[PDB]
Copies of this chain bind each other. A is one copy, B any other.
């Protein structure tokens, strides 16, 4: 897994075979996992393009990773979606998982559509941000933002 380093306010990357002793790790607090929303990358934040980026897939188990820090989203998505028979496309939110804390706009989309699969993944591969918990799959009735996570080392004390 790639690891970025910050020395005197400019991030350089430290490759794994390479070894720098000058770099200092004092504590675990220095290390951090951060989610970043897609809004920053200039992708379209409107609903029609967003519903197009997401897609359903089966045979693939869900995976969850934690991120301590996250970014304020101008756009947040909450999903309630059912089929013509009334069955639910997305699973109920598991325990310990909550919606995105900071959302300027929460778009609610409710309509019927074909469920072709058991779970929902991002086609581009972006994680769905939640409260400090990133999932590759969408959950019902939970505000989320589209984003990706990185791990960095902070030189807080020298």
Contact = CB atoms under 8 A, between A and B. Distances in A.
A27 B96 CA distance: 32
Interface of A: 16, 27, 61, 96, 98
Contacts of A27: 16
A15 to B, nearest CB: 13
Contacts of A16: 27
A93 to B, nearest CB: 12
A16 B61 CA distance: 38
A58 to B, nearest CB: 13
3 contacts: A16-B27, A61-B96, A61-B98
A16 B16 CA distance: 29
A101 to B, nearest CB: 12
A93 B27 CA distance: 36
